Amino acid sequence: MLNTTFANAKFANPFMNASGVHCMTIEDLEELKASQAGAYITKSSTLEKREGNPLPRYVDLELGSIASMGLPNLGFDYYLDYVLKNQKENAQEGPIFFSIAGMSAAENIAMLKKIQESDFSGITELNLSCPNVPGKPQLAYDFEATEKLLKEVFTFFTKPLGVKLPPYFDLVHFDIMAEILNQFPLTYVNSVNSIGNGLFIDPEAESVVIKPKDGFGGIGGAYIKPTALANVRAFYTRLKPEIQIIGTGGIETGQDAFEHLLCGATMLQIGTALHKEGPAIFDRIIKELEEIMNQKGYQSIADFHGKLKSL
Amino acid sequence: MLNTTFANAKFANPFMNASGVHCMTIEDLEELKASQAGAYITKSSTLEKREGNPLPRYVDLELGSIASMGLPNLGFDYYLDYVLKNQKENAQEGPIFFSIAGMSAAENIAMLKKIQESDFSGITELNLSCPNVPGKPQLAYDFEATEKLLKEVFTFFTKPLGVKLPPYFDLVHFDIMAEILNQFPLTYVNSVNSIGNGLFIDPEAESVVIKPKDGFGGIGGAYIKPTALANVRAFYTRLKPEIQIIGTGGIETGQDAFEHLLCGATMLQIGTALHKEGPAIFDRIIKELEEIMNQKGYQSIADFHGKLKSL
């Protein structure tokens, strides 16, 4: 029932981890391969291996999560080696997704050139929205800089590319970004990265709960679903149809998934809830989404994809 | 215990309604006068009366609210008349606050000139962040336009002025806005207006739940508390001490109030929770905040104001 076509590839179901969650090592990635996720994505990588921010840097909250990981990762070459060996095995349905989050424009271009030159045949996600590296703003809140970067990328990069975007809150920003993105042969936009620079306080201790940046961290989970849905929907009605959408933010239940898809998402990623539950989440949420479709008499996601009704 | 000094005036406690909630008519305002609120503020007004957006335009959610009111209000003259007759009675502790949300720069300047020329002795709040008028972006996401407007305002407006700001999600935006605001003799900044252009879906009906703007509305309540606290804290550490802060967003319990005050807020406004509970909320939340202070041995808000600890 959950068969999906995305980036010209076939997936068994739309569900994936979100980048940063359960995907740091090869062991993590093999556990996602082994789970019922339709597809999976590596941790955003940088050219060099990174320890990330000081701890405590992730905390579970009743309504979601707050974190400031600081892009801990094992470095671009580690991930590139892994995806290049797994592609050769032909041991799963659908390509692996490879996320990069260079610490500068130069780092991103260098990694994209290495991907282009490699044999990698999967999908790349360019992360323009990490909100947790000290002193490094979300690039995709700088429309001029984003356009300048993407224009350079598309002078050479011919393989499937999506962009991971921060949440936007003003409809003219959606208009501006769609106009920028629509001039390129982009494969997809992935909406939303964590809501940037939120704060959570333990009122008893009178103190923040993560160490980095005086407690300021990206917010994920049930807090952000309204914004995530709006960002998916707003881009679905403004992007050219050649650019598909991955929906991320506040997905825990089949109902949440069913609301992203109604908005126009084609693939779905799970961050916070997967952090909390582990890869068993995929079998649970798939069954919850199929139960909603069965109740409604739907036998494919095309029966309601994109079909959110206005009043 | 909750005695507060703000804008050079004395208030019995820091709690207020948020603009837009329970403050549309004279009867609404008199009910706030009669409640235990330390202060209250008028609905944001425009030069002409406005019916606002089509209905359904407000919905209660488990984790807060979604709304697109469209600035329904009874027009500038009506509110100016009301505050100018209530000042004359000398019938409460502390000045009334008067919110304005001109549909253009010209409307705001014209309303500020009328306030300046009138006898009004209370406090004015310039709303730069309504996210619900179709085709009118939040002005305070346009740094150049904000600075240009505020420079013109401070050529003539000498009375106490605060600005109601949208949530920011990137620390460089907090730097940019503090640099803009710190050049002026502003009384306060009120952080946060609702999170703009969120979406809420009834999955059974497969449709949005408010009529205007295809169901996109400002989000309030528990969803936005992490963002509101971060905005209050980020401006408290960047603004000159002459500019005080009003905290707004997700306040329902004494604990929530205590967190905003630890961040640096001096006055506190209640939107969604007051919409749900009515003016009886002020007695309840005052008692809850007093119990927190009693348990901690605090006899004034200065015992913990601004004292949030980092790790």
Ligand SMILES: Cc1cc2nc3c(=O)[nH]c(=O)nc-3n(C[C@H](O)[C@H](O)[C@H](O)COP(=O)(O)O)c2cc1C
């Ligand atoms: C622990 C953690 C680390 C994350 N790291 C990344 C990352 O490396 N790259 C990425 O694009 N975003 C990352 N994110 C953001 C998520 O992919 C996702 O966009 C965000 O958590 C919203 O989804 P959620 O509500 O399911 O958590 C991270 C999130 C979390 C909680």
Ligand SMILES: Cc1cc2nc3c(=O)[nH]c(=O)nc-3n(C[C@H](O)[C@H](O)[C@H](O)COP(=O)(O)O)c2cc1C
């Ligand atoms: C029904 C409604 C209408 C509102 N109208 C205004 C308004 O006229 N002016 C204003 O500055 N903000 C308005 N707000 C936003 C609030 O003052 C407050 O900033 C927002 O609701 C966040 O607080 P809360 O979490 O307590 O709701 C509106 C909020 C609601 C729910």
Ligand SMILES: O=C(O)c1cc(=O)[nH]c(=O)[nH]1
């Ligand atoms: O590793 C990080 O901190 C991280 C990266 C990113 O893009 N998003 C986020 O929520 N955290």
Ligand SMILES: O=C(O)c1cc(=O)[nH]c(=O)[nH]1
């Ligand atoms: O009346 C409105 O729609 C309104 C005004 C504003 O500033 N904030 C909001 O949440 N609603």
